[PDB]
């Protein structure tokens, strides 16, 4: 089994202060709702990606499904800000989060899993139909469902997701229904 | 065992639906409640059911009967809980000094 | 009135040791008890704190005396 990435959240400093009204009026697919939130929400189409551009020149880019695709979408957002007229430098690009999900191909019985690992797992059925297991060494949060689908979130690199899944796989096989 | 694991599954997964208690409380207030009220009020009522059934199985174990719960063990369950003040009635103005 | 807690309450009695197949009359007694408890708590909550509004704070003051119920409310709110 391999976990495929579904969501990459990155951040990039453009270095130049922006007034948001000209970007909202000139650029396409740009949404600005200040009485609601203080950023410009511009979406692109080729890579299905969304950017929140802030007035201090910092940009949050989310939605892509690899590191190179997120970097390429961030470059596209920087050049569409640039060609409007602002002098925009690609100062620092950092990926805040990487999210991956996988299916372990059997039903899982969560009550023994909270019974034997109650130090790291918080499980309350009523609200969330899932078990939050916190891995202490990778620093990942895993939502483990009864149907067999596991969601790994809270990672910076890919190898952390891979090591967390290889860590939590023998426990899940030990607790098969 | 194989029944204790099924019983522990029903002890945790069972709940009153939030779509009906929010309909039930709002018929008493008149206007509106919040989601964190319905989350708590659906949780206290599961403890209160577990206050009765765990004590109605003490009535049945005290008498000479089996696990199926007749209403004899359930009217006696509300009687013993009310004598310890567990069942609140806001229509009986009580008086301790006589 | 119909029964709004007929199938849900049968899972809960099995959760506390009754049977897989409880009696309909026992399920009916439990449903009536739950409705009465919810109504009493809602009236006291409307009286205490903000008049005419039932809030989590009012519910917590009302359940403060009973340890089992207070612990469950706190745990559910923190987990949420």
């Amino acid at each position: 089994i391999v976990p495929q990435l579904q969501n990459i959240v990155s951040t990039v400093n453009l270095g130049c202060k922006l007034d948001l009204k000209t970007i909202a009026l000139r650029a396409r697919n740009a949404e600005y709702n200040p009485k609601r939130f203080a950023a410009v929400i511009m979406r692109i189409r080729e890579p299905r990606t969304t950017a929140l551009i802030f007035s201090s020149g910092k940009m949050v880019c989310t939605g892509a499904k690899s590191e190179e695709q997120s970097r390429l979408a961030a470059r596209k957002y920087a050049r569409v800000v640039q060609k409007l007229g602002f002098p925009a430098k690609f100062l620092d690009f950092k990926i805040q989060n990487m999210v991956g999900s996988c299916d372990v191909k059997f039903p899982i019985r969560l009550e023994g899993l909270v019974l034997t690992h109650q130090q790291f797992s918080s499980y309350e059925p009523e609200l969330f139909p899932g078990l939050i297991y916190r891995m202490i060494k990778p620093r990942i949060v895993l939502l483990i469902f009864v149907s067999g689908k596991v969601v790994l979130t809270g990672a910076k690199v890919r190898a952390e997701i891979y090591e967390a899944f290889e860590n939590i796989y023998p426990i899940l096989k030990g607790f098969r229904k | 065992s194989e029944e204790q694991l099924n019983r522990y599954e029903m002890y945790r997964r069972s709940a009153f639906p939030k779509a009906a208690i929010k309909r039930l409380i709002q018929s008493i207030t008149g206007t509106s409640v919040s989601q964190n009220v319905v989350i708590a009020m659906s949780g206290i009522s599961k403890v209160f059911v577990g206050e009765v059934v765990e004590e109605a199985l003490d009535v049945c174990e005290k008498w000479g009967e089996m696990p199926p719960l007749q209403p004899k063990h359930m009217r006696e369950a509300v009687r013993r809980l009310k004598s310890k003040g567990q069942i609140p009635n806001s229509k009986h103005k009580k008086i301790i000094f006589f | 009135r119909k029964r709004l807690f007929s199938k849900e309450l049968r899972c809960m009695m099995y959760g506390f040791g009754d049977d897989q197949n409880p009696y309909t009359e026992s399920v009916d007694i439990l449903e009536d008890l739950v409705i009465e408890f919810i109504t009493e708590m809602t009236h006291k909550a409307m009286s205490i704190g903000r008049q005419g509004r039932v809030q989590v704070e009012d519910i917590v003051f009302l359940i403060r005396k009973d340890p089992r119920k207070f612990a469950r409310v706190k745990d559910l709110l923190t987990m949420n």
């Binding site: 139909p129 009864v146 | 997964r13 069972s14 | 049968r10 899972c11 197949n21 409880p22 009696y23 309909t24």
Partner: peptide, 20 residues
């Protein structure tokens, strides 16, 4: 969310009883 409750109608309460 509805799969935690769908199994709560297949296992428990198969036959309906009554009592005198």
């Amino acid at each position: 969310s509805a799969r935690i409750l769908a199994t709560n109608s297949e296992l428990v309460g198969t036959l309906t009883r009554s009592c005198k």
